[PDB]
Amino acid sequence: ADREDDPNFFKMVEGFFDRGASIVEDKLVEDQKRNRVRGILRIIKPCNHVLSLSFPIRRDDGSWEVIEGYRAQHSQHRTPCKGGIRYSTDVSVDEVKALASLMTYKCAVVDVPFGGAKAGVKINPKNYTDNELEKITRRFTMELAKKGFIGPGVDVPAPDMSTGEREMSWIADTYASTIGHYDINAHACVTGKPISQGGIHGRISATGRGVFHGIENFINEASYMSILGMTPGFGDKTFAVQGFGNVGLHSMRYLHRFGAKCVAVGESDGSIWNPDGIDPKELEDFKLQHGTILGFPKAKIYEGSILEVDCDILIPAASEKQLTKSNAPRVKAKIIAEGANGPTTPEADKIFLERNIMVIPDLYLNAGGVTVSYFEWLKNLNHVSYGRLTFKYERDSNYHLLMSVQESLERKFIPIVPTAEFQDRISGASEKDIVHSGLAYTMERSARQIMRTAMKYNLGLDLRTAAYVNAIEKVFRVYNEAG
Amino acid sequence: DPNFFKMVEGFFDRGASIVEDKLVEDLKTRETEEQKRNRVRGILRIIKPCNHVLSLSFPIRRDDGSWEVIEGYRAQHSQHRTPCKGGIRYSTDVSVDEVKALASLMTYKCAVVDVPFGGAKAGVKINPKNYTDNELEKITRRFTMELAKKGFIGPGVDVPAPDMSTGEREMSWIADTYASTIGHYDINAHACVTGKPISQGGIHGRISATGRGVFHGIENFINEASYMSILGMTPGFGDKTFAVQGFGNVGLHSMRYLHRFGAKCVAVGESDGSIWNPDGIDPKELEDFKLQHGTILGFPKAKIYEGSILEVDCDILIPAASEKQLTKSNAPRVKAKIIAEGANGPTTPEADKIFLERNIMVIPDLYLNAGGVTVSYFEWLKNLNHVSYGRLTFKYERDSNYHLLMSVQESLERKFGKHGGTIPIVPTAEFQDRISGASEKDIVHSGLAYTMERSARQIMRTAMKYNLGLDLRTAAYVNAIEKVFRVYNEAGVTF
Amino acid sequence: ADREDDPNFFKMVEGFFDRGASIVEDKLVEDLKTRETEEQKRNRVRGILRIIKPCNHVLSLSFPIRRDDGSWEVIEGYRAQHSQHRTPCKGGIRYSTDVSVDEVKALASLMTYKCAVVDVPFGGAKAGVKINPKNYTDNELEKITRRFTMELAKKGFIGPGVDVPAPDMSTGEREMSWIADTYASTIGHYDINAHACVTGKPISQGGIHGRISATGRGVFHGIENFINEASYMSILGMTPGFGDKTFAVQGFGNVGLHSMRYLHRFGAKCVAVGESDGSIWNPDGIDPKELEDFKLQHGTILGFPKAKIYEGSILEVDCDILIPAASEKQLTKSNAPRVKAKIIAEGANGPTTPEADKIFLERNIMVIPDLYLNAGGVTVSYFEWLKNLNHVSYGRLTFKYERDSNYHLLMSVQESLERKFGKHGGTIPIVPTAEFQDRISGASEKDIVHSGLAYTMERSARQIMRTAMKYNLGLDLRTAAYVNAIEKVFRVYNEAG
Numbered sequence A: 001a002d003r004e005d006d007p008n009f010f011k012m013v014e015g016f017f018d019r020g021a022s023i024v025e026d027k028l029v030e031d032q033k034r035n036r037v038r039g040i041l042r043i044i045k046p047c048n049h050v051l052s053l054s055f056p057i058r059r060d061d062g063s064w065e066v067i068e069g070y071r072a073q074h075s076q077h078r079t080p081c082k083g084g085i086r087y088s089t090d091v092s093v094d095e096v097k098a099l100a101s102l103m104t105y106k107c108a109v110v111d112v113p114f115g116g117a118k119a120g121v122k123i124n125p126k127n128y129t130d131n132e133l134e135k136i137t138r139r140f141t142m143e144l145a146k147k148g149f150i151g152p153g154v155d156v157p158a159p160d161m162s163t164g165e166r167e168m169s170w171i172a173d174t175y176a177s178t179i180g181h182y183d184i185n186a187h188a189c190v191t192g193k194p195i196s197q198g199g200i201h202g203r204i205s206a207t208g209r210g211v212f213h214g215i216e217n218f219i220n221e222a223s224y225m226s227i228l229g230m231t232p233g234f235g236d237k238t239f240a241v242q243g244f245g246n247v248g249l250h251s252m253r254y255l256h257r258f259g260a261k262c263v264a265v266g267e268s269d270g271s272i273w274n275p276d277g278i279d280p281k282e283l284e285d286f287k288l289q290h291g292t293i294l295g296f297p298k299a300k301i302y303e304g305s306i307l308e309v310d311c312d313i314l315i316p317a318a319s320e321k322q323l324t325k326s327n328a329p330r331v332k333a334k335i336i337a338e339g340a341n342g343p344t345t346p347e348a349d350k351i352f353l354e355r356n357i358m359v360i361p362d363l364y365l366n367a368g369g370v371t372v373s374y375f376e377w378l379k380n381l382n383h384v385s386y387g388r389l390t391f392k393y394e395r396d397s398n399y400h401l402l403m404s405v406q407e408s409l410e411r412k413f414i415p416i417v418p419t420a421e422f423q424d425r426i427s428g429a430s431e432k433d434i435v436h437s438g439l440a441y442t443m444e445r446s447a448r449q450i451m452r453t454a455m456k457y458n459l460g461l462d463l464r465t466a467a468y469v470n471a472i473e474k475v476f477r478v479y480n481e482a483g
Numbered sequence B: 001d002p003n004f005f006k007m008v009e010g011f012f013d014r015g016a017s018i019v020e021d022k023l024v025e026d027l028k029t030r031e032t033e034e035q036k037r038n039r040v041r042g043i044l045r046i047i048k049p050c051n052h053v054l055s056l057s058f059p060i061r062r063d064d065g066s067w068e069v070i071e072g073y074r075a076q077h078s079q080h081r082t083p084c085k086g087g088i089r090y091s092t093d094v095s096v097d098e099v100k101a102l103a104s105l106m107t108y109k110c111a112v113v114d115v116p117f118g119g120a121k122a123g124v125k126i127n128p129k130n131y132t133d134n135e136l137e138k139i140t141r142r143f144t145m146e147l148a149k150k151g152f153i154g155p156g157v158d159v160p161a162p163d164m165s166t167g168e169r170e171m172s173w174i175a176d177t178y179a180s181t182i183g184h185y186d187i188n189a190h191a192c193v194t195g196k197p198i199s200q201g202g203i204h205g206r207i208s209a210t211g212r213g214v215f216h217g218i219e220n221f222i223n224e225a226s227y228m229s230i231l232g233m234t235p236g237f238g239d240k241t242f243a244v245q246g247f248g249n250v251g252l253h254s255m256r257y258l259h260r261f262g263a264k265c266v267a268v269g270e271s272d273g274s275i276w277n278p279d280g281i282d283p284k285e286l287e288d289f290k291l292q293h294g295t296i297l298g299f300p301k302a303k304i305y306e307g308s309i310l311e312v313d314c315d316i317l318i319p320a321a322s323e324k325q326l327t328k329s330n331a332p333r334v335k336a337k338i339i340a341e342g343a344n345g346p347t348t349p350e351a352d353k354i355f356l357e358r359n360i361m362v363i364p365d366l367y368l369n370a371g372g373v374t375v376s377y378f379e380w381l382k383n384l385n386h387v388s389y390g391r392l393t394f395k396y397e398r399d400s401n402y403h404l405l406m407s408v409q410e411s412l413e414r415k416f417g418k419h420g421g422t423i424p425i426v427p428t429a430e431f432q433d434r435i436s437g438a439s440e441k442d443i444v445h446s447g448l449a450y451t452m453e454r455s456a457r458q459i460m461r462t463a464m465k466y467n468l469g470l471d472l473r474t475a476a477y478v479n480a481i482e483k484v485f486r487v488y489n490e491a492g493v494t495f
Numbered sequence C: 001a002d003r004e005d006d007p008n009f010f011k012m013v014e015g016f017f018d019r020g021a022s023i024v025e026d027k028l029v030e031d032l033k034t035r036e037t038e039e040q041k042r043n044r045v046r047g048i049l050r051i052i053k054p055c056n057h058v059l060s061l062s063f064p065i066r067r068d069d070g071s072w073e074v075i076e077g078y079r080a081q082h083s084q085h086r087t088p089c090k091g092g093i094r095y096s097t098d099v100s101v102d103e104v105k106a107l108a109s110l111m112t113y114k115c116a117v118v119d120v121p122f123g124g125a126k127a128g129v130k131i132n133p134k135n136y137t138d139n140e141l142e143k144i145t146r147r148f149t150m151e152l153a154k155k156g157f158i159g160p161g162v163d164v165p166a167p168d169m170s171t172g173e174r175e176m177s178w179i180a181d182t183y184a185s186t187i188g189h190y191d192i193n194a195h196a197c198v199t200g201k202p203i204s205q206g207g208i209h210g211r212i213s214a215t216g217r218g219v220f221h222g223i224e225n226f227i228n229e230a231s232y233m234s235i236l237g238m239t240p241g242f243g244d245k246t247f248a249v250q251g252f253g254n255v256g257l258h259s260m261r262y263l264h265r266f267g268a269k270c271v272a273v274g275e276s277d278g279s280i281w282n283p284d285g286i287d288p289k290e291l292e293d294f295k296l297q298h299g300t301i302l303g304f305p306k307a308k309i310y311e312g313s314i315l316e317v318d319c320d321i322l323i324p325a326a327s328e329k330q331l332t333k334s335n336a337p338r339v340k341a342k343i344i345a346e347g348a349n350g351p352t353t354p355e356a357d358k359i360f361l362e363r364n365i366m367v368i369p370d371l372y373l374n375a376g377g378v379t380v381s382y383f384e385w386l387k388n389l390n391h392v393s394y395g396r397l398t399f400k401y402e403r404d405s406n407y408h409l410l411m412s413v414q415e416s417l418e419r420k421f422g423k424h425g426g427t428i429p430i431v432p433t434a435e436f437q438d439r440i441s442g443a444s445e446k447d448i449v450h451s452g453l454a455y456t457m458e459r460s461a462r463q464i465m466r467t468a469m470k471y472n473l474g475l476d477l478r479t480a481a482y483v484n485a486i487e488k489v490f491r492v493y494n495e496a497g
């Protein structure tokens, strides 16, 4: 099981909504009037629709099996709904409802126009062959489609840590072959697809790059950094990453690239530490040939997590409860960057606020994958890769501008050519560059929105409450201005 | 006004008779000359009347419990371009003839600005002041339902819009009703209507669209030295004077943008009196005065005049209020050389004739009042796109500009050496502000400016082709009829 | 122009609704069992009556047509849907230069109330194309019909479950065939019920058997239902039944010919027949077969050997039943006191003015109203729409089954009697009568459609009689029919919320 399977994490999300809703309530009436505000907040909170399914599957041995599955759509204030599919025996209706609500607020902070949704199929994928996993995926797709729980403009699912791009390809193929055969946008019913099936370039590192951009947007704000007693920028900064999966590896590689020194890396099986620094390329290559980071030559072994290691930035990059009331006073980092959902308990949040430790919340920091999901759905609607018709146009304009400067100067008094970096940007220009710019822009715009919300309500370093209040304000306005 | 409907019909008749002879020559079909003329006249006869008019009677339960039968109508003038496009008026003065004439006006207005929609217009025979917001919502939602069931609202069928009598809240209710019921299975359901609030799929740059269109439309003609030499003036807004009649949203925006480019506002007219100052009137000072007193009367840096400013000595006259202002009696007393119609029908055909005799250039409403229509098209496109303009490219453009400046800096440092130091190539204060504040409204404004520039050149070329001179109104109608004709002709007129 | 084109006929229909709505209003508030105050219940009743009265939707069209000479022509047309309390809407299409939006609205409202009295589940509708069909070739009439169908379909004014048009006196079965063919080929291509989009179609295109005589049989059964009722006949000083009854028919079109043929078949004697060009009269009787054969070979009834010529109408001829079977204003305040008939059977829309109705009520003359008596074609049009939905002709699978059951019943009676009385004197053959044998042998769809029409007219006559007795209307059957229609339409709106 994950932290996203934990019933205490569902209570946490509910409590974050209740806290945010009570803060916005007084300001919303100013902008019978209290009945409309409370009434709309009461509509927003619960999931509008939950579908429970029972569907047959014929195993490879010939025997039949009844599979249990569910999908919750928290909100339709923005259609389609959006949300992953988890294949786990630890899934439940309450999980699927809470994670759907989390997705409504996560989409709102990053201005992604989707209501929240979440699906779960109660099976352990390790007990099934690829053929049986395909059968489960295709039949689940059919049952969701017949009830309005999958469609390009209705509900667009996505993969999870338990599901991948092959399963998403099967969902799109089943939908486009049967129920959505007459839909020109049938392949937009699901995201996380392979490139050969309508997938988007820049999806693999989307979450990791979002964590880097989210951290970068606060680390380069001198107002927030002066409160933490630090200088702006990644130079002369130290960081530790707990959880060395794909998000942890990507975040490690991106901070290192900008001058930050990785002092410690934590894993499910032990942790490594080096105050002089740990190279991400050397550590990734070691893990790819030994299965673990234990025994890394340029680091010392430690039995336990790196949460209390002396660093500036702590990055919980694994979906598990890590920061609690017992270890929160022992944290030596000034910034806690949540690269996964729910790594800090509400009691630890309170301790961090008392200790002047800035926690960049998961609702914002873990929304990079959700942002590039939106771009993949848009790419399938557009039916063209990003930049396909404008890269050559932009290149010619750039050359014409440099030629204009050269001719003007030769007339006045001189080769004006692109730098080695600009020439490489022009030559290698592809879809991933537009997706990366779109993700960086989204993360930057949302960081400023969260900072302005925190200043409007005098929340200081309580960025989590600011992010929830920002999300609730946006969802409220859609309901209020629609009638 | 029924006389305004007769005007629009007369403008079509005038334009259709002018194009008729040239259209038969351009027909490259393998037909006899008698069949070519039958085809041209036949297509012009199809274009003129409204194809469809729907009359509705629908019930509403008032807040007091009593029932009321509401009467409403919607005319779709043309389907040569789908969807249809046009506002909804809530007024007891609406009529089927009004809705038909304004739908036809919208067909020709869209054609001059290359907006791919046929014209449409709706009217609900009620006085909105007599209804609560709850009753206005009931009327709006039920009217939406009755239109949708008969093909008079839909993202690909007919896309309504607000009016002076209706607003963004009503448009939001239309989109919400359509997306909840008839268009529930449509991914583009929220594109069924424009003028929506930003939270419901509205577009940035909608509130100042008509005023910006009045500015850009005036600009394209005022920067053309050929047209300005005929009026005895120099090109550009520098050393130009202007007067605005009607201080609403269009009057204010036009006054702001003309002032920003060097033009001096000498007079401002309002429903209750007018003000005048030959040394100039500041738009920010006048707007602040009106916001705290409800009227422009008593403005300290201006003199009061009892009557309109239409005869005030200026270079540009801007009728920015929807009323008959320029008639055969006051047209010879107009002292302006350019009359910029920032509203529909402010000049009568008799006044147009006097202005042509006096060498006064009238920039017609069909062209100059299409800023809002142009931005309505972009809002509909935004809802189809399901993304705000520039969302994925602003950071990419920003990085490319800095890479461009870095390339110039490195190339110059390499050419002139290090003596005297580095040669910094940085953005101007204005360029930096453009980069930092880059948002959707800048792309919407750019598309509106491009539209007004391309349409001005099209109207100038049509006026030169038919030797119309300063008769820009006939040139705009002929331009619109030529475009509508070509769509019918190249599609075939019998299935 | 027809009586259905007359603006005074539209005012008449509006006045009939207003009269009926004021009568039902007081009784409707008493029957309301909702949890509302006695002041709020009057708002619901008056409010619903205010919604029912006007047409909900009117579509005005302008569409191009290429003439056979190559020139283009813009055609103006309209279709009004009065009510959607019952879907689809139903109503004819008129091709006439005398059509107007007001005509199409009033005739759509008339069709709503006509359908309600005969329990036909359709809201009223009516279309008009402003052209004189005599000025167009069959090819041009096809072009107009197909394009008009296309423009109606794109706006929800034609479709099997939306609006089902029908022919008129100005349109026929070939035009209906073109409507169904255009709809099924383009907009309704994916609809299994595309051919149910229009009625009055030829048999080869999904038409129903019994459609040509539908109006005439409805006039016969409508008259029959009141003429057999001894209570109503004693008030008029007559005996029940068609025996020893005399009748006169004004208008010798299809309604006039069919009505005359069925009344004669039941013992009624035709004393006079009126036509657009003069009239004929014979107090001893006029044979319908002899008169029909004469008109088919001479174009007119004038000069009929077994009858005398008369210049004017037969409205004042001494008879028991007067049947206005032509769409024109015939009975007015000037000739109503000269009418010698005791029953006036309206086989057309609006032949009697409200002033003449008042005179007939004062003279104890029973007027069987057009809303009821002219609903035979409307009833059979419902059956044609049902036949297209069913995708099978009526009786197709049950005629042979019914025949075998009838023979088994007769065999059971024969065997039981032979068992009871023995075989002295022989076998007791139980065989069908000559009439029953002919019914069994000739059993086809028209027999089921005729039974369906006869059942509808019988059930509706009793409903109108009960409404007239409930409101003490006596011989004012027109008000009873309008009140009956308004009560039914009101209940659909009231019980739907």
Ligand SMILES: Nc1ncnc2c1ncn2[C@@H]1O[C@H](COP(=O)(O)OP(=O)(O)O)[C@@H](O)[C@H]1O
Pocket: A078, A104, A107, A108, A110, A111, A112, A113, A114, A115, A474, A475, A478, B198, B199, B201, B202, B204, B387, B388, B391, B440
């Ligand atoms: N998931 C969401 N829920 C509610 N409001 C949203 C959501 N996503 C975006 N919005 C808001 O809807 C509006 C759409 O504005 P627009 O300029 O079209 O898009 P954006 O600026 O997000 O690219 C903004 O006010 C935005 O904050």
Ligand SMILES: Nc1ncnc2c1ncn2[C@@H]1O[C@H](COP(=O)(O)OP(=O)(O)O)[C@@H](O)[C@H]1O
Pocket: B081, B107, B110, B111, B113, B114, B115, B116, B117, B118, B483, B484, B487
């Ligand atoms: N409302 C309209 N009615 C008729 N023709 C139109 C209309 N809007 C645009 N057109 C014409 O249709 C053509 C479409 O050209 P396109 O290049 O796709 O669009 P545009 O140049 O207007 O952006 C052009 O010739 C344009 O002038």
Ligand SMILES: Nc1ncnc2c1ncn2[C@@H]1O[C@H](COP(=O)(O)OP(=O)(O)O)[C@@H](O)[C@H]1O
Pocket: C086, C112, C115, C116, C118, C119, C120, C121, C122, C123, C488, C489, C492
């Ligand atoms: N056009 C109509 N408008 C309103 N009510 C109608 C209409 N036609 C029928 N009704 C009523 O609706 C009900 C339907 O009853 P049902 O037994 O299904 O049909 P029917 O008895 O007419 O064959 C009856 O009470 C009937 O009187």
